[PDB]
Each structure stands twice: as structure tokens, then as C-alpha cells.
Amino acid sequence: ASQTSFSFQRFNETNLILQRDATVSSKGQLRLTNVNDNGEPTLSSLGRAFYSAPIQIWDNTTGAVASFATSFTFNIDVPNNSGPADGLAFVLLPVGSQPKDKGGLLGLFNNYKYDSNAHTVAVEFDTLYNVHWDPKPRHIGIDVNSIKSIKTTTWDFVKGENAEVLITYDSSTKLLVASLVYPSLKTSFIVSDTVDLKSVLPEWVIVGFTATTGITKGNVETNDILSWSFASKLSDGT
Amino acid sequence: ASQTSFSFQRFNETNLILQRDATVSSKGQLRLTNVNDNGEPTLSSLGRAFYSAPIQIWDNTTGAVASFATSFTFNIDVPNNSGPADGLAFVLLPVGSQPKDKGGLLGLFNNYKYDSNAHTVAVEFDTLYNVHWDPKPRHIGIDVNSIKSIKTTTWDFVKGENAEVLITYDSSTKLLVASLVYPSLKTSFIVSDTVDLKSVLPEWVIVGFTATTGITKGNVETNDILSWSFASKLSLNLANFAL
Amino acid sequence: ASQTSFSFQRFNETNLILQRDATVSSKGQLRLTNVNDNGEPTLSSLGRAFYSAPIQIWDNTTGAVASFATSFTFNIDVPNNSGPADGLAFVLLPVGSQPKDKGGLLGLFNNYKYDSNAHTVAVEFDTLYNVHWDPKPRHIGIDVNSIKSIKTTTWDFVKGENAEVLITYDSSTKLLVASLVYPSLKTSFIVSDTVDLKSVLPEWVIVGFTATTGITKGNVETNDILSWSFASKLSLNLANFAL
Amino acid sequence: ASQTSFSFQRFNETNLILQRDATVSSKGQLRLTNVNDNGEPTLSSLGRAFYSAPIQIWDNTTGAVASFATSFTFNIDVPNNSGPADGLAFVLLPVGSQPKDKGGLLGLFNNYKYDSNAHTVAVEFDTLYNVHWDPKPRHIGIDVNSIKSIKTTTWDFVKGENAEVLITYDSSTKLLVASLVYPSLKTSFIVSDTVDLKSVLPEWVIVGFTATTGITKGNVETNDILSWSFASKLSDGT
Ligand SMILES: CC(=O)N[C@H]1[C@H](O[C@H]2[C@@H](O)[C@H](O)[C@@H](CO)O[C@@H]2O)O[C@H](CO)[C@@H](O)[C@@H]1O
Ligand SMILES: CC(=O)N[C@H]1[C@H](O[C@H]2[C@@H](O)[C@H](O)[C@@H](CO)O[C@@H]2O)O[C@H](CO)[C@@H](O)[C@@H]1O
Ligand SMILES: CC(=O)N[C@H]1[C@H](O[C@H]2[C@@H](O)[C@H](O)[C@@H](CO)O[C@@H]2O)O[C@H](CO)[C@@H](O)[C@@H]1O
Ligand SMILES: CC(=O)N[C@H]1[C@H](O[C@H]2[C@@H](O)[C@H](O)[C@@H](CO)O[C@@H]2O)O[C@H](CO)[C@@H](O)[C@@H]1O
Ligand SMILES: *[C@@H]1O[C@H](CO)[C@@H](O)[C@H](O)[C@H]1NC(C)=O
Ligand SMILES: *[C@@H]1O[C@H](CO)[C@@H](O)[C@H](O)[C@H]1NC(C)=O
Ligand SMILES: *[C@@H]1O[C@H](CO)[C@@H](O)[C@H](O)[C@H]1NC(C)=O
Ligand SMILES: *[C@@H]1O[C@H](CO)[C@@H](O)[C@H](O)[C@H]1NC(C)=O
Ligand SMILES: [Ca+2]
Ligand SMILES: [Ca+2]
Ligand SMILES: [Ca+2]
Ligand SMILES: [Ca+2]
Ligand SMILES: [Mn+2]
Ligand SMILES: [Mn+2]
Ligand SMILES: [Mn+2]
Ligand SMILES: [Mn+2]
């Protein structure tokens, strides 16, 4: 009986917390990583954006854990004669969280080891194979306190096509499910694993996105969020 | 303009149209196919169950088509020294529709040929390979006027495990998406394809389920619905719905 | 456990149970009482309209009672050199209920005496003073098994102005609240009282409307429903509902 | 198609902006004005509390105006041998708004004249007659840029009884409606007037409450919010 819900088809900076390169465009697109005046994404970009209100994920008195779901449309595009990098992620982080390392660490980590004090749960849409931890194919991944996903599924990434994502968390089964569909291509992908939010996250978090572009010439992308809905519910006992 | 929503964690016959073998158990479960007096599914069973109010899927005056979503939990169980058959489906059908042939035709069809006047959109959960039309592995299928799915994905069926399904239809993209998760196994499956509702279905439909048991000894299953939510809008927020 | 919600900005007969004179106009309006071929309401008319699916209001196993809310826009208009009669009501009634006596009994009652087997909870919008039971001024009333309201408030009725109604029932406090606003006049009215649903209504009900025209020359009105939303929950967020 | 919704049966300070004397108690009650360790409210108190995310009320490009609704339960109680003062209000204010004068000005105004730059829309629950502007009976009032309500209705205030309020705004009719019911007493009250949000408010606002206690001995109250739900919807055009 704590409940929060929002849904935006267009964005504005007034109710968002924007970090580093993240901007809202004059078309109300949330552009997580830098794009120049020619409309070309640039290298070594990092941006993160969050809803301005913190969200209660669990409660240390009752032991209750929230159920949540989020949907969003994103557009990742690539200039001709480049390949994509590095990707974007929906995230749950500590209130006051600041950006970490760029590139393949997605602004979320400092290295590729597990860190039980990272307090990070993310669903990544990873467009670049990082030899020290990634599966080879592009992938949707569930990340808990590491850039090395606890679970992944192959994602047949296609540049410039709008991708519609749904992520759900059921606190009774502890199941986190992420799916992506490309409506114009009629293709769909799904990954699922259990996550113990209560052991990983603080009681309150900020929710939103992080994204990076490649550090090396020829590996680059736009990372645009086009719409976002979020809902959470945390039982209080009446 | 029009919105409809319902959600049941337990079922009752009062607001449901039950057909053939479909019963509401005394524990509030929707048993679509017959279980005997001991707790065993029986062969050749067919049952269909629908919400008692018709849903408007599209409008010929405005041309608008509904978006909808549905979620349900189901339990398919199989007796020992037996295999599963034949599966269950969520369906959209014309008002007043009657059960068709049982078995692998799921109470929805007379034959395995394409029938352009069947007016059927269904998402099937197929537990038995029918050599004449099915893919070999167990599958989730999107059925449009035919038992031969327009698209399927592999489903790693496991007996007696609760399965959670989400089906969504986006009228702006004409995309129908169906996913199933087994929460205790942490496995997940998704299939997607476009369906033009306006040329397949009448303007008003009934929504619900159909299921069958196998007709041949050793091929049988329970087809139980444990909970069901539906929403439609005709002129969806999926984060809100899934919650 | 159980939740039901619907919202219509335009009506269609397909999902409605229409009774006596109640028609859906070709412009999607729910005309509860008869209008002639020219656009004039006629005397002695009675019409009732219900959502086609039964709603569960309470459960005898658990003891739980539903909370619900409903909102609707209505237009009561009156011809020149005439006064209004007899009004319209939102009702909860047993499944299969038939119209009762017309006129000031609103199609809900046979007489003006308390009937403990009428199984009726209604919110009336009363346009005609019935000397034997009504307060003198026009009123909103909460009717429980009787046409003599358990509670009323003064309603400054104005002909042909759209009226927006909100009715809520909180099962935890047993409180039923009804309010009406005239947006173009900026006037508002509210009445509240407790109703014990569990001892008045069956476990399953039909929700909808009833209306009547006056039986005596010069007392007549249109009773039109322009839009309708309903929600119930059986184990409400009113900020969400009203929006 | 911008939509925001929240509903809390218990409060926590983490997602609220609290000003001056406002606190959240260990029972998760939002206590807008000061209460001492004996549970007695004190004089000359002022507190305000807001949801931490700003809410978009209108849009200067499309001219669209939001529809909203809010419900809340409040408890105003009075020690024996005092009378109540001064009351509480649900408010829509500029982002960054700071408290104004205490007592009968409810933390919202500096005097009792109209001020077209106050950017204030409030629904007041006024428990003390202020001779220079109030109607004599206690009242629910609609306030637009003045402590002198544009419209009022008599409120039969009863100390210590939970009051359930619903406030709705329809941007198509511009009608603001406020109602209060006391469920244990079965009584109910309603006020309605039109308000042009676009001429009064900035495009984005903070939503929440303000309350004060009397400045003069014998005029005092608790001003506790017990639950709160809010929803708004602003058309974007798809
Ligand atoms: C080792 C590796 O993964 N190299 C790829 C490189 O990755 C960058 C940086 O993004 C990574 O976070 C760190 C991991 O320590 O390594 C490098 O510094 O990104 C390139 C594209 O920009 C790839 O071509 C390399 O394969
Ligand atoms: C040909 C075939 O599919 N045989 C399988 C059989 O199918 C039944 C029935 O279920 C089908 O609907 C019709 C299709 O015309 O054929 C048969 O009568 O079901 C058996 C289990 O019940 C399978 O083992 C057969 O392979
Ligand atoms: C006695 C009375 O109420 N007379 C009014 C009359 O009422 C009709 C009918 O509407 C009532 O239901 C029954 C109650 O027994 O009495 C009459 O038959 O309606 C007239 C307008 O139609 C009023 O002017 C009478 O005052
Ligand atoms: C003049 C008046 O209203 N006096 C009442 C007094 O009001 C305070 C303060 O609360 C008001 O905002 C200002 C208006 O200029 O006047 C006074 O300073 O509050 C008393 C209770 O504390 C009442 O008894 C007075 O009637
Ligand atoms: C966001 O809103 C404010 C108006 O409050 C405006 O100043 C700003 O330019 C807006 N940005 C966009 C992209 O709409
Ligand atoms: C269905 O509802 C009726 C009450 O109207 C009741 O007799 C029956 O027990 C209900 N079924 C279940 C499974 O609860
Ligand atoms: C009711 O629905 C049917 C389509 O099934 C249509 O023929 C009729 O025009 C509809 N009524 C209105 C008022 O639109
Ligand atoms: C609010 O939440 C935080 C836990 O994140 C806690 O420190 C604080 O004491 C809480 N207050 C109440 C009243 O629950
Ligand atoms: Ca990578
Ligand atoms: Ca088959
Ligand atoms: Ca009357
Ligand atoms: Ca005052
Ligand atoms: Mn990866
Ligand atoms: Mn099949
Ligand atoms: Mn009456
Ligand atoms: Mn006042």
C-alpha cells in the first residue's frame, strides 16, 4: 500500500536528475549520451538519468519487498562505417549515486569484479562484446553488483529500430524478467533470473538509466529513450 | 473512449460462461478439462470458459482497433506413466461461439486447414506434437483462423509447475506478443508476430480459454487456470498492467 | 482478489442488458426513458440498463465486502410548459431483476413501504416531490429497500445541464457517498450515510440505471446517460478513479 | 500522456520535501505542525510537506492543462480547554517555494490582499475565523493567490475525527471540486469553483500540504496527514 506510478511519452528535465552527458532534446527525447550538432554520436560519452523522487524498494521493519515493472522505448542508432558501443541499462541505485567508469562498464562499475557494496541492480542492453566478461553475441543481461551478468540472452540488435522493453520484478517469487521486442521487425527476446533485492539494494533507491558510447574510433551509438513508464507497489500491511 | 479491466485470483461461475467440461472447483480454480472423482485427468475432455461480458475489439464507424493485455497463471499436470496432451489456449471469438473438435484441434477447429471464416485469434500452449501441422518440440503458438500457428517458439514444458503468461496486443503496431515464465525454474519464453484483428475478428468478441486432453491412452493432462487478469482500451500502459 | 473496472464515453447495447424503454441512441447515448419521433420525452415511460456481467459485492465464505466507485454524466431535460418527473437512479440489484412500478417508484418498488426482500441499494436523483414520502425540494437520496430515502440532500436541479456524479462505497467504514456537480453552473451537492451491503444485497449483483417519466400531463423529462465508469474491489484509490 | 500517480498509507521523509516544523513520526504519520513529547501541539507552529518530484500542471507549447485528483485522510485534534487554530491546506506551488507567514495566513501569504504573483492554488480546511477575511463558520475554501477564498462552504469541524478529503480538477471544465467526509459521523461537505491554472501557476509545481497552529494561547491543534494519494494526467498529443 505504498504505490508509485509514472508514464511519459515525452521528457522534460524538470522532474529528472541528469548526470554527465545526459540531456533532454527539444523534441522531448531523453538522450543519455552525447550527440553533436550534426546529429552524430561522439566517443567516450557517459550519461545517466533518474526520476527525481526516490522509490522504496523494501522495508527493514516489515521485511516487505516491492514488486515493480517498467516499460520503455529506446532507439540506438549507429553511423555508417561504425559499429555500435557500448549500450544502455535500466538501473536501481542508491539515492545520491554518482557515475562510475565509462565504456563497457556502462557508468556503473570501476572494474569487472563482483563488488557486494556496489548496491546495483540493472538490466543491460549490451551492444559490444567485452572479451574479459561478455558473451560474444549482443545480449540482454541481468546485472547484480557486477558488469558480468548473472544471466544473459542473445539480442539480435538492429540499429535505428525502436525497441520496446518490459522489465518486471515479482517480490513473492523474486523473479526479475526482462523482454525486448522490435515491433517493425516482429522479433522478441526474454531473460529471467531471481534477484534478492533486500540483500543487494538499500531500502530506497533512484530508478532510471545509464548509457555509454565506445572509447575507440569506429565503436559508437546514440542511446535515446523515447518513452518510459514505471510502477512499484510495496505492501505496508494496511 | 472504452476501457475494460478485470482481475481474478479465484474464480466463480456467476460471471463466466462455461462450456462442455469446464468447471470451477470448490477451491476457486478454473479446471478447463475434466478431472475424475480421484484427482486424475480423463481422455477426450474439452472445456471452454469465457468472461460473461462481450469486449469490443474494433469499431467500423471510426476504424479504431483495441489494444489489450491479458495475464494468467496456469498449471498443467500429468499422471505418471503418461505424457501430456493436448494443451490450452487463450482466445478471442465471436459472441455465442460453440466448442469445435477436441484433441489437437483445441476445441477451436474442425480440421487443420486454414478457415477464413473461423474468426479466431488464439495463443496456444501446445503440449502434443501433431505430425500434420505442429513443430516437433512443445511450443507456444499464435493461431489466426488455423490450428497451424502463424508463428511459434519452443516451450520447455515442465509438468505441475505454475506458469505465468503475459499476452499483449498493440493496435498501433498490430503486434501480438506472448510470453511465459516458470518462476520456480526461472525459465522464460517469448513469441511475437503481427495480427490484423480488423479483418479476422467481429467487432465484439468474447475472451477466455479453451483446453483439451489427449484422445489416446497415455496422453492426458490437467488444464487449470489459477488466476486471470484482462484489460482493453479502444479509442496500454504495460508497467501498470503487469503489476 | 477480485477487481472489475469499465469506462464508457459512448454506449452500445452489446454489453448492456436493456429493459423496458431503455435504448442506446445512434449517437451512443443511453436514453433510459422513451423519446418520441420528434425529440420529446413521453409520459409513463420506464427503462432500466445494466452492465451485462454480474459483480460480486460480498463473499459468505470470507465475510469480505466489496468497495466500489462509480461515476457518470447525465442530462435531464424538460420540454417547455412542463416540469420534470420522475428522476433516475444508479442501482445495485440481484441478477435477473425485472422492472417494478413506474412513476415515482422509479421502476424499483411496488409501493412506498419498506420492503426487506427488495434487495435494493440505490442512489436516486429525484425530480418530483411525492407528497407521501419525499422531502419537498428536489433531492439526491440514498435508497435502501425503500423509495423513502434513508438520507437525502437538497439538489438544485437545472434542466438540460450536464450533471457529473460520483458515488463511492467504502466497505471498511460501510459509508456510501454520492455527489453531483454541474460544471457549467459550478454548483455541487453531497449526501452520505452508512449502508450494510451484506444484509441487504445478494452476493452477486447487477449494476446500472433506472429512470421514469411522470404519469401526469406536464410532468416529463429525458433521462440520458452520456458516460459511465465503474470500479469494484473485493479482497479504492479515489484519486486514481476520479481521473 | 504525461501521467503521475502515488498513494501512501504511511509516510517516510525520504520522498518528501519537509519545511519548517513538518515531521514524519515513528508511526509514519505526516505531522505538519509541532507536537511536543507529551503529544500536545504547540503555538505559532508552521510546517509544509511536498512530494519530492515536481508535477507538470500545464504546457506553454500545446496550451494543454493537466487534470488531477488527490485524496487524503487528516486528523486535527485539540487539547481540552483550547479551541482549534489555524488549519491545513492542500497546495500547488512553484518549485522551490519557501514558507510565508504563520497563523491565519497558513504559511502561504504575507498579508490578506490579492497577489497575482503568489502563484498559489490551495484548498484550505480553516478552523479559525479571521475577522478581516473569513466567513464566521469553519469552512472548506478554494484559495487562488489570496487567503481570502474565492469560494467557501461551511465545515462542521469535529476535533479528533479522521476526515477523508477528495479534491479533483477537470481541465476541460476548469472546475476544481473539494469534498470532505467524516466516516464515523457520516457527515459530508462539498465546494466547487472554476480556476484557470494556466493564468495562476507556473508550468511545473510542487504538490503537498501546509499547516499552522494559533499564535494566541487557547487556539491550537495537531495537523496530521494520515494517508495521501495523488494522480495527474497531462495530454501531450500522442
Ligand atoms: C578489453 C576490452 O574489452 N576492450 C574493448 C574496449 O573496452 C574498453 C573499455 O570500454 C572497457 O570497459 C575496458 C575493460 O577494462 O577495456 C577497454 O579499455 O572497447 C573497444 C571499443 O571501444 C573494443 O573494441 C575492445 O574490444
Ligand atoms: C495425426 C495426429 O495428429 N495424431 C496424433 C493424435 O491426434 C488426434 C487428434 O488429437 C487430432 O486432432 C487429429 C487431427 O486430425 O488426429 C488424431 O485423431 O493424438 C495422439 C494423442 O492423443 C497422438 O499421439 C497422435 O500422434
Ligand atoms: C401521491 C403522489 O405522489 N402523487 C404524484 C404522482 O405520483 C404518481 C406516481 O408517480 C406515484 O408513484 C404514485 C405513488 O403511489 O402516485 C401517483 O400515481 O405523480 C404526479 C406527476 O406524475 C404528481 O404531480 C403527483 O403529486
Ligand atoms: C485579526 C485576527 O484575525 N486575529 C486573530 C489572530 O490572527 C493573528 C494571525 O493568525 C493572523 O494571520 C493575523 C492577520 O493579520 O492577525 C493576528 O496576528 O489569531 C487569533 C488566534 O491565534 C484569533 O483569536 C484572532 O481573532
Ligand atoms: C522543460 O520545461 C520547462 C518549462 O517549465 C522549459 O523551460 C524547458 O525548456 C522544457 N524543455 C523541453 C525540452 O521541453
Ligand atoms: C460461487 O458463488 C456462489 C455465491 O453466489 C457460491 O455459492 C459458490 O460457493 C461460489 N463458488 C466458489 C468456488 O466460491
Ligand atoms: C453497436 O455495435 C454494433 C457493432 O457490433 C453496431 O452495429 C452499432 O452501430 C453499435 N451502436 C452504436 C450506437 O454505435
Ligand atoms: C524512513 O526510511 C529510512 C530508511 O530508509 C529510515 O532511516 C527512517 O528512520 C524512516 N522513517 C520512518 C518514520 O519510517
Ligand atoms: Ca559489453
Ligand atoms: Ca498440438
Ligand atoms: Ca420523487
Ligand atoms: Ca482562518
Ligand atoms: Mn554484457
Ligand atoms: Mn501447435
Ligand atoms: Mn425521493
Ligand atoms: Mn478561510
Residues in chain B that come right before a backbone break, where C and next N are over 2.5 Å apart: 235
Residue A161 Cα to chain centre, angstroms: 18
For residue C86, is the peptide bond before it cis, meaning its omega torsion is within 30 degrees of 0? Answer: yes
Residue in the block written with cell 469552512: D139
CB contact under 8 A, B239 and A179: no
Would you state the cell numbers that stand for residue C160, as one nine-digit string?
Answer: 438540460
DSSP 8-state symbol, B137: S
What amino acid is encoded at C142 in this protein?
I
d(CA A62, CA D11): 14
The residues pairing with D86 across neighbouring beta strands, listed in sequence order, are D213
Q: What phi and psi, each to the nearest 5 degrees, are found at residue B169?
A: -130, 120
- Is the backbone of residue C70 left (phi > 0), alpha (psi -120 to 50) or beta? beta
For residue B101, is the peptide bond before it cis, meaning its omega torsion is within 30 degrees of 0? Answer: no
Chain B residue nearest residue A5, CA to CA: B240
Question: Which residues lie below 8 Å from residue A11, measured CB to CB, with a gap of 6+?
Answer: A24, A28, A29, A30, A225, A228
Name the residue ranges covered by the structural domains of chain A: 1-238
CB contact under 8 A, B188 and A188: no
Helix (H, G, I), strand (E, B) or coil at C236: coil
Question: Which residues lie below 8 Å from residue C102, measured CB to CB, with a gap of 6+?
Answer: C44, C45, C46, C86, C212, C215
Helix (H, G, I), strand (E, B) or coil at B235: coil
Nearest to D182 by CA among D152, D157, D211: D157
CB of D105 closer than 8 Å to CB of D147: yes
d(CA C162, CA C223): 11
Q: What phi and psi, each to the nearest 5 degrees, are found at residue B156?
A: -80, 75
CB of A70 closer than 8 Å to CB of A227: no
CB of A211 closer than 8 Å to CB of A75: no
Cα-to-centroid distance, B166 and ligand 2 (Å): 28
Task: Give the one of C7, C14, C53 whose C-beta lies nearest to B52's C-beta.
Answer: C53
d(CA C220, CA C159): 11
Would you state the cell numbers that stand for residue B127, as one nine-digit string?
Answer: 503440449
What count of other Cβ atoms lies within 10 Å of the Cβ of residue A35? 21
CB of A191 closer than 8 Å to CB of A152: yes
**What dihedral angle (degrees, nearest 10) is formed by the CA atoms of B83, B86, B88, B93?**
180
Question: Which residues lie below 8 Å from residue C80, measured CB to CB, with a gap of 6+?
Answer: none
CB of A21 closer than 8 Å to CB of A49: no
> Of ligand 8's atoms, which has the minimum distance to the CA of residue D12?
1
Q: Is D25 on the interface with A (CB under 8 A)?
A: no
Max CA pair span of chain B = 56
Nearest to C4 by CA among B208, A1, B3: B3
* Burial of D225 per CB tally in 10 Å (0-12, 13-18, 19+): buried
Q: Report the neighbours of C using a cutoff of 3 or more CB pairs below 8 angstroms.
A: B, D
Q: Report the neighbours of B using a cutoff of 3 or more CB pairs below 8 angstroms.
A: A, C
Max CA pair span of chain D = 58
Task: Give the one of B179, B190, B239 whose C-beta lies nearest to A229's C-beta.
Answer: B239
Q: Which chain D residues have a beta carbon less than 8 Å from that of C175?
A: 181, 183, 186
Chain D residue nearest residue A8, CA to CA: D2
What count of other Cβ atoms lies within 10 Å of the Cβ of residue C217? 8
d(CA B26, CA B21): 15
Would you state the cell numbers that stand for residue D217, as one nine-digit string?
Answer: 494561547
d(CA A195, CA A211): 22
Across chain D, where does the E strand assignment appear? 2-8, 16-20, 23-24, 30-31, 46-51, 55-56, 67-75, 86-94, 121-126, 139-144, 151-154, 163-170, 175-182, 187-194, 204-213, 224-234
For residue A59, is the peptide bond before it cis, meaning its omega torsion is within 30 degrees of 0? Answer: no
d(CA B106, CA B86): 7
- Is the backbone of residue A100 left (phi > 0), alpha (psi -120 to 50) or beta? beta
Q: Which chain B residues have a beta carbon less than 8 Å from that of A177?
A: 179, 181, 188
DSSP 8-state symbol, A37: T
Helix (H, G, I), strand (E, B) or coil at A148: coil
Q: Is D70 on the interface with C (CB under 8 A)?
A: yes
Question: Which secondary structure element, helix H or strand E, spans residue D198, and what is its range?
Answer: helix D197-200
d(CA A190, CA C37): 59
Annotation: CATH topology of A1-238: Jelly Rolls (2.60.120)
Cα-to-centroid distance, B86 and ligand 10 (Å): 6
Chain B residue nearest residue A167, CA to CA: B239
Nearest to B185 by CA among A193, C9, D27: A193
What count of other Cβ atoms lies within 10 Å of the Cβ of residue B111? 12
The residues pairing with D43 across neighbouring beta strands, listed in sequence order, are none
Q: What share of chain C is helix, strand, coil (3-state, %, to 5)?
A: 5, 45, 45
DSSP 8-state symbol, C200: H
For residue A86, is the peptide bond before it cis, meaning its omega torsion is within 30 degrees of 0? Answer: yes
d(CA D82, CA D80): 6
Helix (H, G, I), strand (E, B) or coil at C209: strand
What amino acid is encoded at C125 in this protein?
F
d(CA B19, CA B47): 6
Rg of chain D in Å (alpha carbons): 17
Q: Is A67 on the interface with B (CB under 8 A)?
A: yes
May I ask the CATH architecture of the domain B1-243?
Sandwich (2.60)
Q: Is A184 on the interface with B (CB under 8 A)?
A: yes
> Of ligand 7's atoms, which has the minimum distance to the CA of residue B202?
5
Q: How was this one solved?
A: X-ray
Q: What phi and psi, each to the nearest 5 degrees, are found at residue B185?
A: -100, -15
d(CA D208, CA D185): 26
Nearest to A57 by CA among A191, A238, A230, A209: A230
For A111-223, where are the alpha helices, taking DSSP H only? Answer: 197-200
Rg of chain C in Å (alpha carbons): 17
Max CA pair span of chain A = 58
* Burial of C39 per CB tally in 10 Å (0-12, 13-18, 19+): exposed
What amino acid is encoded at D121 in this protein?
V
Cα-to-centroid distance, C135 and ligand 3 (Å): 14
DSSP 8-state symbol, A103: G
d(CA A2, CA A66): 9
Q: Which chain C residues have a beta carbon less than 8 Å from that of B4?
A: 5-7
Neighbours of ion ligand 9 (CB under 5 A): A 104, 126, 128, 130, 134
For chain B, where are the alpha helices, taking DSSP H only? Answer: 197-200, 238-242
Would you state the cell numbers that stand for residue C47, as one nine-digit string?
Answer: 427503462
CB of D20 closer than 8 Å to CB of D47: yes
Residue B103 Cα to chain centre, angstroms: 15
d(CA C139, CA C123): 10
Q: What phi and psi, each to the nearest 5 degrees, are found at residue D214?
A: -60, 150
DSSP 8-state symbol, C214: -
- Is the backbone of residue D223 left (phi > 0), alpha (psi -120 to 50) or beta? beta
Q: Report the neighbours of D using a cutoff of 3 or more CB pairs below 8 angstroms.
A: A, C
Q: What phi and psi, each to the nearest 5 degrees, are found at residue D211?
A: -160, 155
Chain B: give the shortest CA distance to residue C201, in Å: 15
Q: Is A111 on the interface with D (CB under 8 A)?
A: no
What amino acid is encoded at D85 in this protein?
A
> Of ligand 5's atoms, which has the minimum distance to the CA of residue D61?
14
d(CA C113, CA C142): 15
What count of other Cβ atoms lies within 10 Å of the Cβ of residue C241? 23
Measuring CA to CA, how many Å separate A93 from each of A103, B19, C124, D13? 19, 50, 53, 18
